[PDB]
Each structure stands twice: as structure tokens, then as C-alpha cells.
């Protein structure tokens, strides 16, 4: 345990289901977002733990934990799909965990208006039909 005035109330995981390509659920693991690690408990033995920001692009759909990490190890390279009810917690948290370490979370949808970027077209010219 450790005798140095160290509390235990600091565990935030999420029972996420490990789904395959199709998405018919495989088993069920505990997604953990420690102070510096995405430890995805599974089979009470295998721990798919990344370095948090070691990912590449992470998303979620209502109650679906989606996270993709570049080539490294554990399971391999590719996108990951998970089914949980605390999808919000995990995401929301992560989004915060990133701001704490200035981590990269290039967010695309941010409700725009009219058009921020510009494409090659102007100036225009009359064709004269």
C-alpha cells in the first residue's frame, strides 16, 4: 500500500465491451484512465494500456467508446470499438486529461458558420454566352 499519506480514492475506469469489426461484442474489459495511462483491463490478466495520448484519433457515439492508436503493441494497429454506458465520462474526462498536458486532440466539428476556410476559385470571370 505505502505509508506516506497516500489516498486510494482515485480510480476512474469504465466497463467497456471489446467489440470486433462487425460489432457483436467479444467479452468485456475495464477501461482505465489513470493519471497517465489508458489501461484497458481484460481477461483479468491482459492489460491493453497505452500512453494516453499515444492514440491517433479518438471518438464516441452516444454510448460507444471509439479510440484509435498508431502502431505500437498490445493488440496492434487499427481502430478500436467499445460499447459502454459511461462513454461520456471516458470521453469528457480524456478531453480534460488532454488539456492538462496540452495533448493533441484536433477537434473537427466545432459548429461553424457560413465558411471559415477558403477554396481556389475567386476572382471569377464572365463567360459571355
Amino acid at each position: 500500500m505505502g505509508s506516506d499519506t497516500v489516498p486510494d480514492n482515485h480510480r476512474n475506469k469504465f466497463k467497456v465491451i471489446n467489440v470486433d469489426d462487425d460489432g457483436n461484442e467479444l467479452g468485456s474489459g475495464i477501461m482505465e484512465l489513470t493519471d497517465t495511462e489508458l489501461i484497458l483491463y481484460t481477461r483479468k490478466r491482459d492489460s491493453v494500456k497505452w500512453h494516453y495520448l499515444c492514440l491517433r484519433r479518438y471518438g464516441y457515439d452516444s454510448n460507444l467508446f471509439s479510440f484509435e492508436s498508431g502502431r505500437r503493441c498490445q493488440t496492434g494497429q487499427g481502430i478500436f470499438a467499445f460499447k459502454c454506458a459511461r462513454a461520456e465520462e471516458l470521453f469528457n474526462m480524456l478531453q480534460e486529461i488532454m488539456q492538462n498536458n496540452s495533448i493533441n486532440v484536433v477537434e473537427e466539428p466545432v459548429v461553424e458558420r457560413n465558411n471559415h476556410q477558403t477554396e481556389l476559385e475567386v476572382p471569377r470571370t464572365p463567360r459571355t454566352p
Partner: peptide, 22 residues
Amino acid sequence: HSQMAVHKLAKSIPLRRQVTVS
């Protein structure tokens, strides 16, 4: 594979958001 849980998708999914964390 090392067993693990997090399966592989190798294909995007109908997500509601879009935050690509490098």
C-alpha cells in the same frame, strides 16, 4: 495479438463527434 481485449476495426464508425487525438 497477445489476447488483449480491444479488438481491431480497421474502419471508421458512425461517430457523433470528431476529436482526432494524435
